[PDB]
Structure formats: C-alpha cells, structure tokens
Amino acid sequence: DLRLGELLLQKGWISREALEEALVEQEKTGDLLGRILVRKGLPEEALYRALAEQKGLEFLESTEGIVPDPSAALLLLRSDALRYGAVPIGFQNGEVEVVLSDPRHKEAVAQLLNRPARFYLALPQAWEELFRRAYPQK
Amino acid sequence: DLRLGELLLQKGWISREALEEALVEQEKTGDLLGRILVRKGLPEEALYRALAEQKGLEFLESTEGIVPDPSAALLLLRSDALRYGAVPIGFQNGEVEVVLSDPRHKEAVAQLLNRPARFYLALPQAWEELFRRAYPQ
Ligand SMILES: Nc1nc2c(ncn2[C@@H]2O[C@@H]3COP(=O)(O)O[C@H]4[C@@H](O)[C@H](n5cnc6c(=O)[nH]c(N)nc65)O[C@@H]4COP(=O)(O)O[C@H]3[C@H]2O)c(=O)[nH]1
Ligand SMILES: Nc1nc2c(ncn2[C@@H]2O[C@@H]3COP(=O)(O)O[C@H]4[C@@H](O)[C@H](n5cnc6c(=O)[nH]c(N)nc65)O[C@@H]4COP(=O)(O)O[C@H]3[C@H]2O)c(=O)[nH]1
C-alpha cells in the first residue's frame, strides 16, 4: 500500500527534504530509490527493514544462528538459489522457510516454489554467508 | 567521545528534532535516552550497535552458536555473572571473552576480572539464553 519513501517517512528514518532530494535525482537518473537514499546517508539496515515491512517479510538481523536444513536446500538448484537470491533453510508447520536477498524477488520465488512458504529478508553480507553454508561451491 | 544522541544522528537513525524532543522528554521523565528513542521507532539492535561502538564493545547479533567454555565460566561466580550481566565464554590470545548485557557495566566488570579481556554486547534475550547455557542450574 505504502511506497518506500512514505514508509521511511512514517517511521521517522528520513526527512521530507531528504526524500524529495532523492526523488528529484531519480527523475534525472532512474536509479533505484533506496540506493539513492542510502548513498545520501540512510542506514542500509533502515532501508531493508522498510522493504521487509512493505512486502510482508520478516527482517533477519542475523543469519549466523541458522543451521540450513539440507533437505530444504534440495528444493532449489544452487544456480536458482543464487539467481533468485533465495536460500531455503528449513520447514515450519508444512511451510518452507526461505531467506531472500531482495524483496522484489519474493513473488518470482514464491511462484517457482509453488508451495506454502514463509519468507525472510537478510542484509547482503548476512545473505551471502548463509548461501555459502547452505550451498557449498563443491 | 561522542554521546549516544549524536552517534545516532550522524548515522541517520534519528532527526535532530527527534533528538532534541527526546532529551526534553528525558528532562521530565529521567528515562534513558535509548529507551525513549526505541519507543519512538529506533530498532533496539541499532541502539545496541551504537552503545557498543561508544564503549569499544563488539556487538553480537546472535549468541546461538556460542558453546560456553566451562574453564572460562569459572572466572566469575554465577551470582556475579548475574549481578554484573557478564558471561565469560572462552579465551582468545590470552584474553577472556566476556559477553555483557549492559555496556554501562563494562568498567565494573573489567576491574573485577583484573585480566586482559575482550568485551561483547548482546541484546537481553540473547544474553539470557547464553547466561543459562554457561551457568546452568
Ligand atoms: N532491493 C531493493 N528494493 C528497492 C529499493 N528501492 C525501492 N525498492 C523497491 O523497488 C520498487 C521500485 O523502486 P523505484 O524504482 O525506485 O520506483 C519507486 C520510486 O520511483 C517511487 N517512490 C518510492 N517511494 C516514493 C514516495 O514516497 N513518494 C513518491 N512521490 N514516489 C516514491 O515509486 C516507485 C515505486 O516505489 P515502491 O512501491 O516502494 O517499489 C519500489 C520498492 O519496493 C532498493 O534500494 N533495493
Ligand atoms: N543499557 C542502556 N544504556 C543506555 C541507554 N541510553 C544510554 N545508555 C548509556 O547510559 C548513559 C546515560 O544515559 P542517559 O541517562 O540518557 O544520560 C545522557 C543523556 O542525558 C545525554 N545525552 C546522550 N546523548 C546526547 C546528545 O546527543 N546530545 C545532548 N545535548 N545530550 C545527550 O548525556 C547523557 C550521557 O549520555 P552517554 O554519554 O551517551 O551515556 C549514556 C549511554 O552510554 C539505553 O537505552 N540502554
């Protein structure tokens, strides 16, 4: 319902002038809005918390405690896990738990999995650490 | 030596008007600045990362993988680990690794331990789960 800029405004993590400056730049550059905001000083975690709320994802402050379930990992080929930015990590109540790197990929991943799923969002470094543990390059 | 408010303002978690507002409220209520800011929308994790930076602590996002070394837990009576909010979890390079629940207790704990130490900080639930693991019963 709410766009990213409005979400951040509502949470008090950007100012109206900071948002307008970003939207004015975007209309000249076409860069992703969150990228402009972060480049101008928005904490990257603030961006991801807002993006998670927008797509109904649970934001994961860390992936270090996750022990990836090998049987969940079989639900995506490694090449697909990397391309879609999705790590299946386990099961809860007959749903597969999946950690995304980019909320914009939730729908594409959900369609692919074609089963009940619970989605999480992790920061880039946290996501890559998790991916490598779930999908060793071996 | 930056105070918490300007630490958070520089990062961009709070506006300047929100900081002034929170300190004005604190003048009436006396609550901690971090608790007011968290009530006003600051993530608790962002608060603890700033508090860790301020006191030279390493903030731990998670304690789930830590297996507490019993040899290190011996360095504090359980009663002291609870009162000081400090869990010794192991040793690195001749320093004892200690996980604090509150960065304000760093100096008191360091004086007591009286040996080289590496200090970490953890959010309350993660700290409690680690404390029960290191100091069972
Ligand atoms: N992984 C990742 N995802 C990002 C990032 N920035 C945005 N996303 C998401 O990608 C979608 C397209 O972003 P946009 O290209 O900047 O296109 C934006 C942007 O041009 C504009 N916009 C965003 N917020 C506002 C606002 O508050 N006010 C106005 N007038 N326009 C806004 O509306 C369009 C739709 O925005 P949204 O519905 O929120 O949809 C956004 C948002 O869900 C990022 O840095 N990283
Ligand atoms: N466990 C926990 N610890 C917390 C929390 N908030 C602060 N601490 C820490 O406790 C000390 C006392 O916080 P305070 O009572 O709000 O008393 C504060 C506060 O009244 C004020 N203050 C803090 N930041 C600012 C600022 O940016 N500008 C101004 N003018 N005053 C500030 O200076 C005094 C000292 O602030 P600090 O040096 O940063 O020292 C702070 C900080 O290290 C919390 O929510 N939980």
Residue numbers in the entry:
A (entry chain A): 165 to 302
B (entry chain B): 165 to 301
What does the original paper state about this entry?
Initially, we introduced arginine residues at these positions to reestablish an MshEN-like binding mode. We found a 25-fold higher KD value of 150 ± 7 nM for K167R compared to the WT (6 nM) and a 4-fold higher KD value of 23 ± 2 nM for L196R. The PilF159-302 K167R variant crystallized well and diffracted up to 1.8 Å with the macromolecular chain being traceable from residue 165 to 301 without interruption. The structure of chain A showed that in this mutant R167 is indeed involved in a cation-π-stacking interaction with the GMP1 guanine base. However, only partial electron density is observed for the side chain of R167 and the neighboring E170 in chain B of the crystal structure and there the R167 side chain guanidine group appears to be oriented towards a phosphate group of the ligand. Thus, the R167 stacking interaction with the guanine base of the ligand seems to be more dynamic and less energetically favorable than the equivalent interaction in the WT. In comparison to MshEN (chain A), the arginine side chain in chain A is positioned more towards the center of the guanine base. This is most likely due to the presence of E170, which positions R167 by forming simultaneous hydrogen bonds with its backbone amide and the guanidinium group of its side chain. The loss of binding affinity for PilF159-302 K167R in combination with the presence of a more dynamic cation-π-stacking interaction of R167 on the guanine base of GMP1 indicate that a lysine side chain at this position is beneficial for c-di-GMP binding most likely due to the presence of more extensive hydrophobic interactions.
